[PDB]
Ligand binder design. Sequence first.
Ligand SMILES: *[C@@H]1O[C@H](CO)[C@@H](O[C@@H]2O[C@H](CO)[C@@H](O)[C@H](O)[C@H]2NC(C)=O)[C@H](O)[C@H]1NC(C)=O
Ligand SMILES: Cc1cccc(C)c1OC[C@H](C)N
Ligand SMILES: [K+]
Ligand SMILES: [K+]
Length: 497
Amino acid sequence: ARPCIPKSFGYSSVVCVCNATYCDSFDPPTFPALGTFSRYESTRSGRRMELSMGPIQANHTGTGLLLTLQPEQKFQKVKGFGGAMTDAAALNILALSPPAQNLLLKSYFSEEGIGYNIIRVPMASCDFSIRTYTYADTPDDFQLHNFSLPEEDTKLKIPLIHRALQLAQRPVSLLASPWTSPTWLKTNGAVNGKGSLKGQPGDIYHQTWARYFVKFLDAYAEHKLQFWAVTAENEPSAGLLSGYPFQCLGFTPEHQRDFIARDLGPTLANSTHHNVRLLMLDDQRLLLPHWAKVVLTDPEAAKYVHGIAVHWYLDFLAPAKATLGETHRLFPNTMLFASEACVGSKFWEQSVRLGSWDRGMQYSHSIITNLLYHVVGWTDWNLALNPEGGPNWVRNFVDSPIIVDITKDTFYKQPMFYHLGHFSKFIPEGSQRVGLVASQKNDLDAVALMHPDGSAVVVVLNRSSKDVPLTIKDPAVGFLETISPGYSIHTYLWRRQ
Ligand SMILES: *[C@@H]1O[C@H](CO)[C@@H](O[C@@H]2O[C@H](CO)[C@@H](O)[C@H](O)[C@H]2NC(C)=O)[C@H](O)[C@H]1NC(C)=O
Ligand SMILES: Cc1cccc(C)c1OC[C@H](C)N
Ligand SMILES: [K+]
Ligand SMILES: [K+]
């Protein structure tokens, strides 16, 4: 129904302004009739997921560029898209007025929004927190009698999480990850700094750390929230670095391997939560394939790991083929999942850039590259941040698809938000990536998938300044003549007979 209200802040494109009385929204989703394709277009010049429709044609002639769908060439099935309800997300969101708060959650979780079906929940406090705490701060409580949830959980996250679920018609999957244990389980006795669990997998400390995961799920189950999956540790390599500035817990791969095999997996297997999946790694892609090689070649650990979670810092370059591609090759049955993405992490960089097309382009290119290397899911970091990229208790600010302006009761939908929605809205859970062949060398980036119901979705990204005319062929159905303007992203949808 409602278009974008664009404001500029002096970066390359615009944000969409939402408040207590107005937000950009889509109508209830329909597909076009057979013979007709839908095209959603966003541009640096200002367009924001503007729907257009075109005929699907029987013949095509040209020398021009041709993308030909390979609908019977099938890759991964997609789990979904989401972001993280961190403390700071929660705080930003609840600092808005009920109406603005509600249009923000609509924005992400509703079919008038961009159809998120994943929420990552930090287990207690991380850097995007204002207190340091765990659920079990009383020292030497090995049986976790004094384990409990504080208000960060019971008043901010859990209520917002239930609200996001009410708005979504898609089933929504929660993912948990802890940053640190209680300090009294750690070699260095602090939430941060170099250090890991004391003792050895199998022992009291390790069994207590694994019983903490069960208490965590037990406690969220009291509030009627079930988890789809947990990671074994957020960025386990962080806790191995001297000076590490915020909450962390260090594992070598050998250590994570043993802890999964002897403690966490078994502990989880013998709880009511045996159906929660366990994801390993939950760190940067350059740790692959070596980490998977260490963990998944051990059969006692291997039988507990459902997938491998990877982190993307889009500020930084790293190979995709030699890491994700190699890991898929060695371990094709284990799924790959992107649990965290973020832009603007570099201290020297403006944390929040209101209107950056470039950072939107970065989000899309990453999702595409992820999809091309067999990853089944992509999860953004903080759902909402302030205009500083906070709050963050060690001043570790970063960008977010949504920026809250509490003083004006306003929030701003960045280009990022739309780049991500070009995927999240139009690829439901159980979609399968299919193949896509380009007839010639070209500057586009593209991905094609098939809906559970057999409908086609292709997203095309133009990072170049030039308007590339092109054609998409569906062998069964016909041709789509179109164009990919410089600095644009499009998503195409159609029914297949
Ligand atoms: C929320 O934002 C909308 C859009 O910016 C505001 O409505 C606009 O108000 C200005 C000034 O009266 C007019 O130029 C426009 O005609 C209005 N646009 C629309 C779409 O109604 C609205 O006043 C803002 N609300 C609050 C509470 O701040
Ligand atoms: C747009 C496109 C679609 C399918 C296959 C290829 C290789 C392709 O080009 C990617 C290349 C980076 N420009
Ligand atoms: K407690
Ligand atoms: K920064």
